[PDB]
Design a binder for this molecule. Structure first.
Ligand code: S5Z
Ligand code: ZN
Ligand code: ZN
Ligand code: ZN
Length: 231
Protein backbone atom coordinates (compact mmCIF):
# COMPACT_ATOMS: atom_id res chain seq x y z
CA UNK A 1 0.00 0.00 0.00
CA UNK A 2 3.02 2.30 0.36
CA UNK A 3 3.44 4.42 -2.80
CA UNK A 4 6.42 3.58 -4.99
CA UNK A 5 8.33 5.56 -7.59
CA UNK A 6 6.33 3.88 -10.37
CA UNK A 7 3.08 5.36 -9.03
CA UNK A 8 4.16 8.99 -8.46
CA UNK A 9 5.05 11.18 -11.47
CA UNK A 10 7.70 13.80 -10.81
CA UNK A 11 5.84 16.88 -9.61
CA UNK A 12 3.19 15.00 -7.61
CA UNK A 13 3.20 14.16 -3.90
CA UNK A 14 1.43 11.43 -1.95
CA UNK A 15 0.60 11.36 1.76
CA UNK A 16 0.69 8.09 3.71
CA UNK A 17 -0.85 7.77 7.17
CA UNK A 18 1.49 5.86 9.51
CA UNK A 19 -0.49 6.35 12.72
CA UNK A 20 -2.95 8.82 14.20
CA UNK A 21 -1.64 12.32 13.55
CA UNK A 22 1.47 11.09 11.70
CA UNK A 23 1.92 10.92 7.93
CA UNK A 24 4.83 10.48 5.60
CA UNK A 25 4.93 12.47 2.38
CA UNK A 26 6.40 10.85 -0.71
CA UNK A 27 7.70 12.70 -3.75
CA UNK A 28 9.92 11.78 -6.69
CA UNK A 29 12.73 13.52 -8.51
CA UNK A 30 14.63 12.89 -11.73
CA UNK A 31 18.39 12.64 -11.29
CA UNK A 32 21.15 11.27 -13.50
CA UNK A 33 18.74 9.42 -15.79
CA UNK A 34 16.64 7.59 -13.20
CA UNK A 35 13.74 8.48 -10.91
CA UNK A 36 13.99 8.22 -7.13
CA UNK A 37 11.44 8.46 -4.31
CA UNK A 38 11.94 10.50 -1.16
CA UNK A 39 10.16 10.58 2.20
CA UNK A 40 9.37 13.34 4.63
CA UNK A 41 7.13 13.45 7.71
CA UNK A 42 3.99 15.28 8.86
CA UNK A 43 3.14 15.36 12.57
CA UNK A 44 -0.06 16.88 13.92
CA UNK A 45 0.67 19.55 16.54
CA UNK A 46 -2.71 20.22 18.12
CA UNK A 47 -4.57 22.19 15.45
CA UNK A 48 -1.33 22.79 13.51
CA UNK A 49 1.10 20.60 11.58
CA UNK A 50 4.84 20.11 11.97
CA UNK A 51 6.55 19.33 8.66
CA UNK A 52 9.77 17.31 8.52
CA UNK A 53 11.74 18.01 5.33
CA UNK A 54 10.77 19.42 1.94
CA UNK A 55 9.53 17.35 -1.00
CA UNK A 56 12.82 17.65 -2.94
CA UNK A 57 12.35 20.85 -4.93
CA UNK A 58 10.31 24.03 -5.28
CA UNK A 59 7.64 22.50 -7.53
CA UNK A 60 7.28 19.33 -5.43
CA UNK A 61 7.05 21.35 -2.21
CA UNK A 62 4.36 23.62 -3.63
CA UNK A 63 2.42 20.46 -4.50
CA UNK A 64 3.15 19.08 -1.03
CA UNK A 65 1.52 22.12 0.59
CA UNK A 66 -1.49 21.88 -1.75
CA UNK A 67 -1.90 18.17 -0.99
CA UNK A 68 -1.66 18.79 2.77
CA UNK A 69 -4.25 21.57 2.56
CA UNK A 70 -6.51 19.29 0.50
CA UNK A 71 -6.26 16.08 2.54
CA UNK A 72 -5.57 17.34 6.09
CA UNK A 73 -6.67 20.98 6.06
CA UNK A 74 -4.55 22.06 9.02
CA UNK A 75 -1.85 24.75 8.68
CA UNK A 76 1.83 23.90 8.40
CA UNK A 77 3.35 26.32 10.91
CA UNK A 78 6.91 24.97 11.23
CA UNK A 79 9.30 22.86 9.16
CA UNK A 80 12.51 21.08 10.17
CA UNK A 81 15.12 20.01 7.61
CA UNK A 82 17.14 17.00 8.78
CA UNK A 83 20.23 17.66 6.66
CA UNK A 84 21.47 20.05 3.99
CA UNK A 85 20.78 18.12 0.77
CA UNK A 86 18.12 19.21 -1.72
CA UNK A 87 15.68 16.46 -0.72
CA UNK A 88 15.58 18.14 2.72
CA UNK A 89 16.02 21.89 2.06
CA UNK A 90 15.00 22.08 -1.61
CA UNK A 91 11.71 23.95 -1.34
CA UNK A 92 12.53 25.94 1.82
CA UNK A 93 12.04 29.16 -0.15
CA UNK A 94 8.54 28.00 -1.12
CA UNK A 95 7.76 27.11 2.50
CA UNK A 96 9.04 30.49 3.71
CA UNK A 97 6.98 32.34 1.09
CA UNK A 98 3.90 30.46 2.32
CA UNK A 99 4.46 31.62 5.91
CA UNK A 100 6.06 28.43 7.24
CA UNK A 101 8.81 28.93 9.81
CA UNK A 102 11.74 26.85 8.57
CA UNK A 103 14.25 25.30 10.98
CA UNK A 104 17.57 23.50 10.91
CA UNK A 105 20.67 23.10 13.04
CA UNK A 106 23.47 25.64 12.59
CA UNK A 107 25.47 22.74 11.12
CA UNK A 108 22.86 22.13 8.42
CA UNK A 109 22.45 25.85 7.70
CA UNK A 110 26.22 26.29 7.30
CA UNK A 111 26.59 23.31 4.96
CA UNK A 112 23.57 24.38 2.90
CA UNK A 113 25.12 27.83 2.47
CA UNK A 114 28.45 26.34 1.37
CA UNK A 115 26.64 24.14 -1.16
CA UNK A 116 24.58 27.02 -2.53
CA UNK A 117 21.35 25.33 -1.40
CA UNK A 118 18.32 26.93 0.22
CA UNK A 119 18.78 27.85 3.87
CA UNK A 120 16.18 27.39 6.63
CA UNK A 121 15.66 30.64 8.52
CA UNK A 122 15.79 29.51 12.16
CA UNK A 123 18.60 27.71 13.98
CA UNK A 124 17.95 24.69 16.21
CA UNK A 125 20.18 24.93 19.28
CA UNK A 126 21.36 22.06 21.44
CA UNK A 127 22.18 19.49 18.74
CA UNK A 128 25.91 20.05 18.12
CA UNK A 129 27.22 16.96 19.96
CA UNK A 130 26.50 13.31 19.22
CA UNK A 131 23.75 12.00 21.46
CA UNK A 132 22.13 15.43 21.85
CA UNK A 133 18.33 15.51 21.89
CA UNK A 134 15.88 18.42 22.14
CA UNK A 135 12.09 18.58 22.17
CA UNK A 136 10.44 20.38 19.25
CA UNK A 137 6.68 20.43 19.68
CA UNK A 138 5.25 16.93 19.18
CA UNK A 139 8.59 15.30 18.25
CA UNK A 140 12.06 14.82 19.67
CA UNK A 141 15.03 15.87 17.54
CA UNK A 142 18.15 13.74 17.93
CA UNK A 143 21.66 14.15 16.54
CA UNK A 144 23.19 10.63 16.46
CA UNK A 145 26.53 11.79 15.08
CA UNK A 146 27.91 11.94 11.57
CA UNK A 147 26.56 9.32 9.16
CA UNK A 148 24.96 9.95 5.76
CA UNK A 149 26.12 13.53 6.40
CA UNK A 150 27.91 15.22 9.28
CA UNK A 151 24.71 17.10 10.19
CA UNK A 152 21.99 14.47 9.81
CA UNK A 153 19.21 14.53 12.41
CA UNK A 154 16.63 11.88 13.23
CA UNK A 155 13.11 12.57 14.48
CA UNK A 156 11.02 10.53 16.93
CA UNK A 157 7.27 10.84 17.51
CA UNK A 158 6.79 9.37 21.02
CA UNK A 159 2.98 9.43 20.84
CA UNK A 160 3.08 7.04 17.86
CA UNK A 161 6.45 5.27 18.36
CA UNK A 162 7.49 6.45 14.89
CA UNK A 163 11.22 6.80 14.25
CA UNK A 164 12.10 8.97 11.25
CA UNK A 165 15.69 8.16 10.34
CA UNK A 166 16.13 10.34 7.31
CA UNK A 167 18.84 9.45 4.84
CA UNK A 168 21.07 8.03 7.59
CA UNK A 169 18.77 4.97 7.40
CA UNK A 170 18.41 2.84 4.26
CA UNK A 171 15.39 0.81 3.19
CA UNK A 172 15.74 -2.97 3.18
CA UNK A 173 15.67 -3.21 -0.62
CA UNK A 174 18.79 -1.02 -0.96
CA UNK A 175 21.92 -3.17 -0.72
CA UNK A 176 24.49 -0.72 -2.13
CA UNK A 177 25.57 2.60 -0.69
CA UNK A 178 23.83 5.45 -2.48
CA UNK A 179 24.86 9.10 -2.17
CA UNK A 180 27.80 8.91 0.25
CA UNK A 181 29.83 11.83 -1.12
CA UNK A 182 29.16 13.72 2.13
CA UNK A 183 29.04 10.73 4.50
CA UNK A 184 31.24 9.81 7.45
CA UNK A 185 31.56 6.09 6.72
CA UNK A 186 33.85 5.56 9.71
CA UNK A 187 31.31 6.97 12.20
CA UNK A 188 28.07 5.87 10.50
CA UNK A 189 27.83 2.49 12.33
CA UNK A 190 28.50 4.14 15.69
CA UNK A 191 25.86 6.79 14.98
CA UNK A 192 23.29 4.11 14.14
CA UNK A 193 24.09 2.40 17.44
CA UNK A 194 23.20 5.64 19.23
CA UNK A 195 19.82 5.64 17.46
CA UNK A 196 19.15 2.05 18.51
CA UNK A 197 20.14 2.78 22.12
CA UNK A 198 17.94 5.89 22.28
CA UNK A 199 14.77 4.57 20.58
CA UNK A 200 14.59 0.81 21.27
CA UNK A 201 10.80 1.06 21.54
CA UNK A 202 10.26 2.36 18.00
CA UNK A 203 7.57 0.43 16.14
CA UNK A 204 7.85 2.24 12.77
CA UNK A 205 11.13 3.23 11.10
CA UNK A 206 11.00 5.64 8.14
CA UNK A 207 14.02 5.84 5.81
CA UNK A 208 14.86 8.94 3.82
CA UNK A 209 14.08 6.99 0.64
CA UNK A 210 11.89 3.96 0.15
CA UNK A 211 9.72 1.61 2.15
CA UNK A 212 9.27 1.99 5.93
CA UNK A 213 9.80 -0.97 8.19
CA UNK A 214 10.87 -1.80 11.71
CA UNK A 215 14.05 -1.40 13.72
CA UNK A 216 15.67 -4.02 11.46
CA UNK A 217 16.40 -1.14 9.07
CA UNK A 218 19.14 0.09 11.41
CA UNK A 219 21.20 -3.11 11.36
CA UNK A 220 20.51 -3.37 7.63
CA UNK A 221 22.02 0.09 7.12
CA UNK A 222 25.06 -0.87 9.21
CA UNK A 223 25.51 -3.97 7.04
CA UNK A 224 25.36 -1.96 3.81
CA UNK A 225 27.71 0.72 5.15
CA UNK A 226 30.29 -1.81 6.31
CA UNK A 227 30.09 -3.71 3.02
CA UNK A 228 30.74 -0.47 1.14
CA UNK A 229 33.59 0.38 3.54
CA UNK A 230 35.31 -2.92 2.62
CA UNK A 231 34.69 -2.35 -1.10
O1 S5Z B 1 20.62 15.55 -3.33
C1 S5Z B 1 21.29 14.66 -3.87
O2 S5Z B 1 22.40 14.83 -4.45
C2 S5Z B 1 20.74 13.22 -3.84
C3 S5Z B 1 20.81 12.49 -5.02
C4 S5Z B 1 20.35 11.18 -5.10
C5 S5Z B 1 19.80 10.55 -3.99
C6 S5Z B 1 19.33 9.15 -4.13
C7 S5Z B 1 20.04 8.20 -4.88
C8 S5Z B 1 19.59 6.89 -4.99
C9 S5Z B 1 18.43 6.48 -4.35
C10 S5Z B 1 17.72 7.41 -3.60
C11 S5Z B 1 18.16 8.72 -3.49
C12 S5Z B 1 19.73 11.28 -2.80
C13 S5Z B 1 20.19 12.60 -2.70
C14 S5Z B 1 20.08 13.32 -1.40
S1 S5Z B 1 20.28 12.23 0.01
ZN1 ZN C 1 21.32 13.44 1.68
ZN1 ZN D 1 10.49 33.06 11.77
ZN1 ZN E 1 18.17 11.66 0.81
Amino acid sequence: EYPTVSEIPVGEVRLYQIADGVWSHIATQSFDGAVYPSNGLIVRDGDELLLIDTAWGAKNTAALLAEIEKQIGLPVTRAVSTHFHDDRVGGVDVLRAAGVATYASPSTRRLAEVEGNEIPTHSLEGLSSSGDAVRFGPVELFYPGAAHSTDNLVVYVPSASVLYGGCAIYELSRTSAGNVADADLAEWPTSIERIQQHYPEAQFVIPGHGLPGGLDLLKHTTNVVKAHTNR
